[PDB]
């Protein structure tokens, strides 16, 4: 699945750079120019989500009490609550990925850095597996860039 691959690449890249605190310059080897644009939009939108819901994100992180691999494995049951109500839109998808970045940031500080990759594939799992048809209909990562374009 090229979409699973491309989404995993973008998401894993965004979560890894968020835990690090500094943005990379090296190229994306699968995603392409679509992935470059997708990651750039995700950086602008995702950071504007993380700031606008900073208190709510801090509270959710505290309440979740993530400290080990079992907690990271169970986080998939929390991820589905973003789609639980039958609502699917780019606004929900960005929030799902922005919080993923917040968790990844927490996992790095609490020295559980090896659990970031498992989390990134879990976000991609819930996205690409439960919402494939909608993503493809919405023109995947191109539609994502087109939807959030402001001008």
């Amino acid at each position, epitope marked *: 699945d090229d979409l699973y691959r491309q989404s995993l690449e973008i998401i894993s890249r965004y979560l890894r750079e968020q835990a690090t605190g500094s943005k990379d310059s090296k190229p994306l080897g699968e995603a392409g120019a679509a992935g470059r644009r997708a990651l750039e939009t995700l950086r602008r939108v995702g950071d504007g989500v993380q700031r606008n819901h900073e208190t709510a994100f801090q509270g959710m992180l505290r309440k979740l009490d993530i400290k080990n691999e079992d907690d990271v494995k169970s986080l998939s049951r929390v991820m589905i609550h973003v789609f639980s109500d039958g609502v699917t839109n780019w606004g929900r998808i960005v929030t799902l990925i922005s919080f993923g970045a917040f968790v990844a940031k927490h996992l790095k500080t609490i020295n559980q850095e090896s659990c970031i990759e498992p989390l990134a594939e879990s976000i991609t799992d819930v996205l690409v597996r439960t919402k494939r048809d909608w993503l493809v209909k919405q023109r995947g990562w191109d539609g994502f860039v*087109e939807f959030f374009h402001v001008e």
Partner: antibody
Amino acid sequence: QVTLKESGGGLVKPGGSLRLSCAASGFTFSSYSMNWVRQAPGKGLEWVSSISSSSSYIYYADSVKGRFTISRDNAKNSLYLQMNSLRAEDTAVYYCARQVGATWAFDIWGQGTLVTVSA
Amino acid sequence: SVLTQPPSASGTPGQRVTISCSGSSSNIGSNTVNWYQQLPGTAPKLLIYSNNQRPSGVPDRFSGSKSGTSASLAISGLQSEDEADYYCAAWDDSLNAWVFGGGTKLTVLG
């Protein structure tokens, strides 16, 4: 001034090929899905083809599948339509239309370019 | 065409005219409907987007609605300047294509 201007339309023989071009101005072209819509004189609008911002998602009407090829050059703010194996029924004014990211409405249209398929 | 519209519509000045657009579950039933106005000898222009939203410049007289697999365009206060071809359009999920209605030619009589 946000504009779209089609070019390349003209007389072509049945079985022939023609390339239409559409120049975008005043906006960030690489952040929009684009469309071709045609209209036979005195007849209705018929959507032809669509291409996403990074060319990852391409669509065609059944009436044009295997004969028309849509593509775009984001560096040249250009949309193209390579039409091959042209028949009388392809005679129409071809429009270029920008698609809104959030609603999918075709907010900007070009003035159109006439293609006449005749011997 | 996949979306059907009455070929023609008519009314007198000031009357309220209605133009229907009939589709299926995979087009109007799954997606928003847009309307285009094509004045004689002009390129089409966006009239209505998201079923009932008006772009800047479209007067209050135009309104749209959607229910089930059908959509409707309502022109209150018919004027001679409303004489045009009206088209509805919706994305179709089962075809992976945009479907335009056949078009409605509006004549303002009387």
